[PDB]
């Protein structure tokens, strides 16, 4: 079932929201 | 372990790798994986016909693009300071 596969892959895409902010300065 | 097509899968596998590299503070390799991943996800978007899938891929693409920007701003800043 290609449709359900595709939908599942999209649903489970990873998140960056746990990653620490990366500041830049001098 | 490589074939043609399957853009979505390739893109997701690379970003999964980027996030682990990112987590490990290996930002040079992380960035490379992010942009490789993003190239594939862009292709995925181009040929995605399901509007909901497209919206969701696009939302994630944006998030990754944002992270990748942070890493490049960091990496090039660092290189300049090394001089």
Tab-separated table of N, CA, C and O in Angstrom:
chain	number	residue	atom	x	y	z
A	1	UNK	N	0.821	-1.208	0.000
A	1	UNK	CA	0.000	0.000	0.000
A	1	UNK	C	0.862	1.269	0.000
A	1	UNK	O	1.265	1.762	1.053
A	2	UNK	N	1.156	1.799	-1.192
A	2	UNK	CA	2.039	2.966	-1.297
A	2	UNK	C	1.513	4.216	-0.583
A	2	UNK	O	2.310	4.973	-0.023
A	3	UNK	N	0.198	4.424	-0.604
A	3	UNK	CA	-0.395	5.611	0.001
A	3	UNK	C	-0.141	5.646	1.508
A	3	UNK	O	0.349	6.647	2.032
A	4	UNK	N	-0.458	4.543	2.187
A	4	UNK	CA	-0.310	4.447	3.637
A	4	UNK	C	1.159	4.533	4.062
A	4	UNK	O	1.483	5.111	5.102
A	5	UNK	N	2.042	3.956	3.253
A	5	UNK	CA	3.478	4.084	3.475
A	5	UNK	C	3.923	5.549	3.435
A	5	UNK	O	4.555	6.050	4.367
A	6	UNK	N	3.602	6.216	2.330
A	6	UNK	CA	3.956	7.621	2.155
A	6	UNK	C	3.430	8.470	3.304
A	6	UNK	O	4.155	9.275	3.865
A	7	UNK	N	2.167	8.268	3.666
A	7	UNK	CA	1.554	9.012	4.761
A	7	UNK	C	2.279	8.774	6.083
A	7	UNK	O	2.468	9.694	6.864
A	8	UNK	N	2.683	7.529	6.321
A	8	UNK	CA	3.384	7.170	7.544
A	8	UNK	C	4.761	7.837	7.626
A	8	UNK	O	5.126	8.400	8.656
A	9	UNK	N	5.508	7.786	6.529
A	9	UNK	CA	6.826	8.397	6.481
A	9	UNK	C	6.732	9.883	6.802
A	9	UNK	O	7.509	10.406	7.610
A	10	UNK	N	5.767	10.564	6.184
A	10	UNK	CA	5.612	11.998	6.425
A	10	UNK	C	5.254	12.255	7.888
A	10	UNK	O	5.834	13.128	8.534
A	11	UNK	N	4.305	11.474	8.397
A	11	UNK	CA	3.850	11.590	9.779
A	11	UNK	C	5.004	11.499	10.772
A	11	UNK	O	5.013	12.188	11.797
A	12	UNK	N	5.975	10.644	10.461
A	12	UNK	CA	7.048	10.325	11.398
A	12	UNK	C	8.355	11.069	11.167
A	12	UNK	O	9.368	10.703	11.744
A	13	UNK	N	8.333	12.099	10.321
A	13	UNK	CA	9.523	12.912	10.077
A	13	UNK	C	10.045	13.479	11.388
A	13	UNK	O	9.259	13.875	12.240
A	14	UNK	N	11.375	13.531	11.544
A	14	UNK	CA	11.964	13.914	12.829
A	14	UNK	C	11.832	15.404	13.094
A	14	UNK	O	11.537	16.198	12.195
A	15	UNK	N	12.048	15.768	14.345
A	15	UNK	CA	11.885	17.137	14.802
A	15	UNK	C	13.239	17.696	15.236
A	15	UNK	O	14.081	16.948	15.732
A	16	UNK	N	13.461	18.989	15.037
A	16	UNK	CA	14.669	19.622	15.550
A	16	UNK	C	14.389	20.314	16.877
A	16	UNK	O	15.296	20.886	17.483
A	17	UNK	N	13.140	20.266	17.335
A	17	UNK	CA	12.726	21.122	18.453
A	17	UNK	C	13.401	20.801	19.793
A	17	UNK	O	13.365	21.621	20.710
A	18	UNK	N	14.060	19.653	19.902
A	18	UNK	CA	14.826	19.359	21.107
A	18	UNK	C	16.251	19.900	21.108
A	18	UNK	O	16.916	19.923	22.138
A	19	UNK	N	16.727	20.336	19.949
A	19	UNK	CA	18.116	20.756	19.797
A	19	UNK	C	18.369	22.122	20.434
A	19	UNK	O	17.514	23.003	20.381
A	20	UNK	N	19.555	22.303	21.029
A	20	UNK	CA	19.873	23.562	21.712
A	20	UNK	C	20.127	24.674	20.717
A	20	UNK	O	20.751	24.447	19.682
A	21	UNK	N	19.642	25.868	21.028
A	21	UNK	CA	19.878	27.014	20.166
A	21	UNK	C	21.378	27.261	20.024
A	21	UNK	O	22.166	27.025	20.944
A	22	UNK	N	21.775	27.718	18.846
A	22	UNK	CA	23.185	27.862	18.525
A	22	UNK	C	23.471	29.309	18.198
A	22	UNK	O	23.303	29.726	17.053
A	23	UNK	N	23.881	30.088	19.213
A	23	UNK	CA	24.100	31.526	19.045
A	23	UNK	C	25.381	31.824	18.306
A	23	UNK	O	26.351	31.063	18.351
A	24	UNK	N	25.365	32.950	17.613
A	24	UNK	CA	26.552	33.455	16.974
A	24	UNK	C	26.783	34.875	17.484
A	24	UNK	O	25.835	35.641	17.693
A	25	UNK	N	28.047	35.205	17.717
A	25	UNK	CA	28.430	36.551	18.091
A	25	UNK	C	29.827	36.793	17.569
A	25	UNK	O	30.203	36.260	16.516
A	26	UNK	N	30.601	37.585	18.303
A	26	UNK	CA	31.996	37.795	17.957
A	26	UNK	C	32.812	36.554	18.309
A	26	UNK	O	32.565	35.913	19.336
B	1	UNK	N	22.989	-0.576	-1.480
B	1	UNK	CA	22.038	0.114	-0.628
B	1	UNK	C	21.622	1.478	-1.206
B	1	UNK	O	21.084	2.320	-0.490
B	2	UNK	N	21.893	1.698	-2.488
B	2	UNK	CA	21.421	2.896	-3.176
B	2	UNK	C	20.623	2.515	-4.420
B	2	UNK	O	20.980	1.586	-5.144
B	3	UNK	N	19.531	3.228	-4.658
B	3	UNK	CA	18.754	3.064	-5.878
B	3	UNK	C	18.270	4.436	-6.305
B	3	UNK	O	18.414	5.392	-5.549
B	4	UNK	N	17.709	4.550	-7.505
B	4	UNK	CA	17.165	5.833	-7.944
B	4	UNK	C	15.729	5.997	-7.435
B	4	UNK	O	15.048	5.015	-7.158
B	5	UNK	N	15.281	7.242	-7.301
B	5	UNK	CA	13.935	7.526	-6.840
B	5	UNK	C	13.865	7.587	-5.329
B	5	UNK	O	14.870	7.848	-4.683
B	6	UNK	N	12.677	7.355	-4.780
B	6	UNK	CA	12.451	7.348	-3.333
B	6	UNK	C	13.006	8.593	-2.646
B	6	UNK	O	13.723	8.502	-1.639
B	7	UNK	N	12.660	9.749	-3.195
B	7	UNK	CA	13.202	11.015	-2.725
B	7	UNK	C	12.868	11.280	-1.267
B	7	UNK	O	13.733	11.718	-0.502
B	8	UNK	N	11.624	10.996	-0.877
B	8	UNK	CA	11.193	11.269	0.486
B	8	UNK	C	12.043	10.486	1.467
B	8	UNK	O	12.573	11.054	2.426
B	9	UNK	N	12.184	9.183	1.217
B	9	UNK	CA	12.937	8.320	2.107
B	9	UNK	C	14.383	8.778	2.224
B	9	UNK	O	14.920	8.880	3.323
B	10	UNK	N	15.014	9.058	1.091
B	10	UNK	CA	16.405	9.501	1.111
B	10	UNK	C	16.559	10.775	1.949
B	10	UNK	O	17.474	10.894	2.768
B	11	UNK	N	15.639	11.710	1.761
B	11	UNK	CA	15.685	12.976	2.474
B	11	UNK	C	15.527	12.802	3.972
B	11	UNK	O	16.243	13.424	4.767
B	12	UNK	N	14.591	11.938	4.356
B	12	UNK	CA	14.326	11.690	5.765
B	12	UNK	C	15.504	10.980	6.426
B	12	UNK	O	15.899	11.334	7.549
B	13	UNK	N	16.085	10.002	5.732
B	13	UNK	CA	17.247	9.304	6.278
B	13	UNK	C	18.430	10.264	6.504
B	13	UNK	O	19.141	10.168	7.508
B	14	UNK	N	18.630	11.210	5.589
B	14	UNK	CA	19.743	12.139	5.737
B	14	UNK	C	19.517	13.143	6.886
B	14	UNK	O	20.448	13.511	7.608
B	15	UNK	N	18.283	13.596	7.051
B	15	UNK	CA	18.013	14.550	8.112
B	15	UNK	C	18.062	13.825	9.454
B	15	UNK	O	18.501	14.383	10.464
B	16	UNK	N	17.644	12.566	9.475
B	16	UNK	CA	17.765	11.803	10.709
B	16	UNK	C	19.238	11.719	11.105
B	16	UNK	O	19.599	11.880	12.284
B	17	UNK	N	20.088	11.510	10.108
B	17	UNK	CA	21.526	11.486	10.341
B	17	UNK	C	22.069	12.851	10.775
B	17	UNK	O	22.889	12.934	11.692
B	18	UNK	N	21.619	13.917	10.120
B	18	UNK	CA	22.004	15.273	10.513
B	18	UNK	C	21.675	15.577	11.975
B	18	UNK	O	22.491	16.163	12.684
B	19	UNK	N	20.481	15.179	12.416
B	19	UNK	CA	20.017	15.475	13.772
B	19	UNK	C	20.881	14.775	14.825
B	19	UNK	O	21.191	15.359	15.865
B	20	UNK	N	21.283	13.534	14.552
B	20	UNK	CA	22.221	12.835	15.421
B	20	UNK	C	23.589	13.514	15.447
B	20	UNK	O	24.180	13.677	16.517
B	21	UNK	N	24.092	13.883	14.264
B	21	UNK	CA	25.359	14.602	14.150
B	21	UNK	C	25.270	15.933	14.892
B	21	UNK	O	26.179	16.296	15.624
B	22	UNK	N	24.151	16.627	14.701
B	22	UNK	CA	23.842	17.898	15.352
B	22	UNK	C	23.874	17.733	16.879
B	22	UNK	O	24.558	18.486	17.586
B	23	UNK	N	23.136	16.736	17.368
B	23	UNK	CA	23.098	16.380	18.780
B	23	UNK	C	24.498	16.151	19.350
B	23	UNK	O	24.780	16.525	20.494
B	24	UNK	N	25.371	15.563	18.534
B	24	UNK	CA	26.742	15.252	18.948
B	24	UNK	C	27.697	16.440	18.786
B	24	UNK	O	28.904	16.302	18.997
B	25	UNK	N	27.145	17.588	18.398
B	25	UNK	CA	27.886	18.835	18.210
B	25	UNK	C	28.971	18.672	17.147
B	25	UNK	O	30.019	19.313	17.211
B	26	UNK	N	28.700	17.811	16.168
B	26	UNK	CA	29.554	17.652	14.989
B	26	UNK	C	28.956	18.450	13.835
B	26	UNK	O	28.449	17.886	12.862
B	27	UNK	N	29.016	19.769	13.961
B	27	UNK	CA	28.228	20.673	13.134
B	27	UNK	C	28.622	20.731	11.665
B	27	UNK	O	27.771	20.977	10.811
B	28	UNK	N	29.896	20.512	11.354
B	28	UNK	CA	30.327	20.515	9.956
B	28	UNK	C	29.682	19.359	9.171
B	28	UNK	O	29.084	19.557	8.111
B	29	UNK	N	29.787	18.154	9.710
B	29	UNK	CA	29.166	16.992	9.094
B	29	UNK	C	27.632	17.086	9.153
B	29	UNK	O	26.946	16.734	8.193
B	30	UNK	N	27.110	17.587	10.274
B	30	UNK	CA	25.676	17.781	10.449
B	30	UNK	C	25.116	18.664	9.347
B	30	UNK	O	24.126	18.321	8.700
B	31	UNK	N	25.757	19.809	9.126
B	31	UNK	CA	25.297	20.720	8.104
B	31	UNK	C	25.249	20.067	6.720
B	31	UNK	O	24.302	20.270	5.957
B	32	UNK	N	26.287	19.307	6.395
B	32	UNK	CA	26.362	18.612	5.111
B	32	UNK	C	25.176	17.656	4.941
B	32	UNK	O	24.517	17.631	3.896
B	33	UNK	N	24.888	16.903	5.989
B	33	UNK	CA	23.755	15.996	5.978
B	33	UNK	C	22.432	16.760	5.868
B	33	UNK	O	21.530	16.317	5.165
B	34	UNK	N	22.317	17.910	6.537
B	34	UNK	CA	21.084	18.688	6.464
B	34	UNK	C	20.846	19.132	5.034
B	34	UNK	O	19.724	19.043	4.523
B	35	UNK	N	21.883	19.632	4.373
B	35	UNK	CA	21.638	20.190	3.046
B	35	UNK	C	21.456	19.105	1.991
B	35	UNK	O	20.692	19.302	1.048
B	36	UNK	N	22.139	17.969	2.141
B	36	UNK	CA	21.867	16.791	1.301
B	36	UNK	C	20.424	16.332	1.469
B	36	UNK	O	19.729	15.999	0.490
B	37	UNK	N	19.977	16.316	2.722
B	37	UNK	CA	18.617	15.907	3.027
B	37	UNK	C	17.599	16.847	2.425
B	37	UNK	O	16.619	16.419	1.806
B	38	UNK	N	17.853	18.140	2.589
B	38	UNK	CA	16.978	19.177	2.073
B	38	UNK	C	16.843	19.136	0.542
B	38	UNK	O	15.762	19.383	0.007
B	39	UNK	N	17.933	18.842	-0.163
B	39	UNK	CA	17.871	18.698	-1.615
B	39	UNK	C	16.882	17.598	-2.011
B	39	UNK	O	16.092	17.768	-2.948
B	40	UNK	N	16.927	16.470	-1.300
B	40	UNK	CA	16.017	15.360	-1.605
B	40	UNK	C	14.571	15.674	-1.235
B	40	UNK	O	13.653	15.331	-1.983
B	41	UNK	N	14.369	16.333	-0.095
B	41	UNK	CA	13.019	16.692	0.346
B	41	UNK	C	12.371	17.696	-0.589
B	41	UNK	O	11.140	17.717	-0.729
B	42	UNK	N	13.196	18.555	-1.197
B	42	UNK	CA	12.707	19.508	-2.187
B	42	UNK	C	12.177	18.731	-3.384
B	42	UNK	O	11.160	19.086	-3.968
B	43	UNK	N	12.883	17.670	-3.754
B	43	UNK	CA	12.439	16.834	-4.869
B	43	UNK	C	11.147	16.128	-4.467
B	43	UNK	O	10.204	16.041	-5.257
B	44	UNK	N	11.120	15.627	-3.233
B	44	UNK	CA	9.929	14.990	-2.672
B	44	UNK	C	8.710	15.900	-2.780
B	44	UNK	O	7.624	15.476	-3.194
B	45	UNK	N	8.898	17.158	-2.394
B	45	UNK	CA	7.841	18.165	-2.466
B	45	UNK	C	7.331	18.373	-3.876
B	45	UNK	O	6.133	18.534	-4.088
B	46	UNK	N	8.258	18.386	-4.831
B	46	UNK	CA	7.950	18.691	-6.215
B	46	UNK	C	6.969	17.687	-6.797
B	46	UNK	O	6.140	18.032	-7.628
B	47	UNK	N	7.073	16.441	-6.346
B	47	UNK	CA	6.311	15.352	-6.933
B	47	UNK	C	5.310	14.742	-5.964
B	47	UNK	O	4.714	13.702	-6.250
B	48	UNK	N	5.131	15.388	-4.820
B	48	UNK	CA	4.100	14.979	-3.868
B	48	UNK	C	2.751	15.526	-4.333
B	48	UNK	O	2.610	16.730	-4.523
B	49	UNK	N	1.767	14.648	-4.509
B	49	UNK	CA	0.474	15.082	-5.034
B	49	UNK	C	-0.591	15.212	-3.945
B	49	UNK	O	-1.593	15.901	-4.139
B	50	UNK	N	-0.365	14.562	-2.805
B	50	UNK	CA	-1.268	14.641	-1.662
B	50	UNK	C	-1.038	15.979	-0.967
B	50	UNK	O	0.061	16.241	-0.477
B	51	UNK	N	-2.067	16.837	-0.936
B	51	UNK	CA	-1.899	18.183	-0.375
B	51	UNK	C	-1.516	18.159	1.091
B	51	UNK	O	-0.769	19.035	1.523
B	52	UNK	N	-2.010	17.185	1.849
B	52	UNK	CA	-1.713	17.173	3.278
B	52	UNK	C	-0.267	16.768	3.475
B	52	UNK	O	0.458	17.410	4.238
B	53	UNK	N	0.153	15.723	2.759
B	53	UNK	CA	1.556	15.304	2.754
B	53	UNK	C	2.483	16.460	2.383
B	53	UNK	O	3.472	16.723	3.070
B	54	UNK	N	2.128	17.177	1.329
B	54	UNK	CA	2.911	18.313	0.863
B	54	UNK	C	3.067	19.398	1.929
B	54	UNK	O	4.180	19.870	2.169
B	55	UNK	N	1.953	19.780	2.558
B	55	UNK	CA	1.963	20.746	3.664
B	55	UNK	C	2.867	20.312	4.810
B	55	UNK	O	3.587	21.122	5.397
B	56	UNK	N	2.806	19.028	5.144
B	56	UNK	CA	3.567	18.513	6.273
B	56	UNK	C	5.056	18.418	5.962
B	56	UNK	O	5.889	18.789	6.796
B	57	UNK	N	5.387	17.917	4.772
B	57	UNK	CA	6.773	17.911	4.308
B	57	UNK	C	7.323	19.329	4.264
B	57	UNK	O	8.460	19.582	4.665
B	58	UNK	N	6.504	20.245	3.764
B	58	UNK	CA	6.917	21.635	3.604
B	58	UNK	C	7.179	22.280	4.975
B	58	UNK	O	8.151	23.028	5.157
B	59	UNK	N	6.310	21.987	5.935
B	59	UNK	CA	6.485	22.489	7.297
B	59	UNK	C	7.795	21.996	7.918
B	59	UNK	O	8.506	22.753	8.589
B	60	UNK	N	8.111	20.723	7.710
B	60	UNK	CA	9.362	20.172	8.216
B	60	UNK	C	10.569	20.745	7.468
B	60	UNK	O	11.627	20.983	8.061
B	61	UNK	N	10.417	20.928	6.160
B	61	UNK	CA	11.499	21.434	5.326
B	61	UNK	C	11.936	22.776	5.881
B	61	UNK	O	13.126	23.090	5.919
B	62	UNK	N	10.952	23.549	6.322
B	62	UNK	CA	11.179	24.882	6.865
B	62	UNK	C	11.952	24.826	8.167
B	62	UNK	O	12.907	25.582	8.378
B	63	UNK	N	11.523	23.925	9.043
B	63	UNK	CA	12.202	23.695	10.301
B	63	UNK	C	13.678	23.327	10.077
B	63	UNK	O	14.557	23.894	10.719
B	64	UNK	N	13.946	22.387	9.171
B	64	UNK	CA	15.319	21.941	8.879
B	64	UNK	C	16.144	23.053	8.256
B	64	UNK	O	17.328	23.202	8.547
B	65	UNK	N	15.517	23.803	7.355
B	65	UNK	CA	16.160	24.953	6.728
B	65	UNK	C	16.622	25.953	7.786
B	65	UNK	O	17.711	26.529	7.693
B	66	UNK	N	15.769	26.165	8.779
B	66	UNK	CA	16.058	27.052	9.912
B	66	UNK	C	17.227	26.561	10.759
B	66	UNK	O	18.067	27.350	11.199
B	67	UNK	N	17.272	25.258	10.999
B	67	UNK	CA	18.376	24.687	11.758
B	67	UNK	C	19.663	24.780	10.956
B	67	UNK	O	20.703	25.171	11.489
B	68	UNK	N	19.591	24.431	9.675
B	68	UNK	CA	20.759	24.463	8.819
B	68	UNK	C	21.351	25.865	8.753
B	68	UNK	O	22.568	26.012	8.710
B	69	UNK	N	20.496	26.888	8.765
B	69	UNK	CA	20.951	28.281	8.720
B	69	UNK	C	21.765	28.588	9.972
B	69	UNK	O	22.870	29.136	9.896
B	70	UNK	N	21.218	28.210	11.122
B	70	UNK	CA	21.920	28.351	12.392
B	70	UNK	C	23.306	27.712	12.366
B	70	UNK	O	24.267	28.279	12.898
B	71	UNK	N	23.412	26.520	11.782
B	71	UNK	CA	24.699	25.826	11.767
B	71	UNK	C	25.701	26.511	10.839
B	71	UNK	O	26.891	26.567	11.145
B	72	UNK	N	25.233	27.006	9.696
B	72	UNK	CA	26.136	27.657	8.745
B	72	UNK	C	26.621	28.983	9.302
B	72	UNK	O	27.793	29.327	9.162
B	73	UNK	N	25.721	29.728	9.939
B	73	UNK	CA	26.094	30.986	10.589
B	73	UNK	C	27.147	30.699	11.656
B	73	UNK	O	28.102	31.454	11.809
B	74	UNK	N	26.978	29.596	12.385
B	74	UNK	CA	27.986	29.172	13.359
B	74	UNK	C	29.317	28.758	12.709
B	74	UNK	O	30.378	29.256	13.082
B	75	UNK	N	29.259	27.866	11.732
B	75	UNK	CA	30.468	27.309	11.128
B	75	UNK	C	31.374	28.367	10.488
B	75	UNK	O	32.591	28.355	10.686
B	76	UNK	N	30.783	29.282	9.731
B	76	UNK	CA	31.575	30.273	8.997
B	76	UNK	C	32.129	31.330	9.938
B	76	UNK	O	33.246	31.822	9.743
B	77	UNK	N	31.325	31.691	10.938
B	77	UNK	CA	31.771	32.539	12.046
B	77	UNK	C	33.018	31.944	12.709
B	77	UNK	O	34.011	32.635	12.943
B	78	UNK	N	32.957	30.651	12.995
B	78	UNK	CA	34.060	29.939	13.615
B	78	UNK	C	35.320	29.944	12.768
B	78	UNK	O	36.424	30.099	13.295
B	79	UNK	N	35.150	29.748	11.464
B	79	UNK	CA	36.271	29.733	10.536
B	79	UNK	C	36.965	31.085	10.501
B	79	UNK	O	38.189	31.161	10.407
B	80	UNK	N	36.162	32.144	10.557
B	80	UNK	CA	36.665	33.516	10.547
B	80	UNK	C	37.440	33.807	11.823
B	80	UNK	O	38.474	34.478	11.799
B	81	UNK	N	36.937	33.301	12.943
B	81	UNK	CA	37.623	33.490	14.212
B	81	UNK	C	38.926	32.698	14.281
B	81	UNK	O	39.850	33.071	15.004
B	82	UNK	N	39.005	31.619	13.507
B	82	UNK	CA	40.209	30.793	13.461
B	82	UNK	C	41.350	31.503	12.735
B	82	UNK	O	42.502	31.065	12.793
B	83	UNK	N	41.028	32.597	12.050
B	83	UNK	CA	42.025	33.338	11.282
B	83	UNK	C	42.616	34.507	12.079
B	83	UNK	O	41.899	35.228	12.783
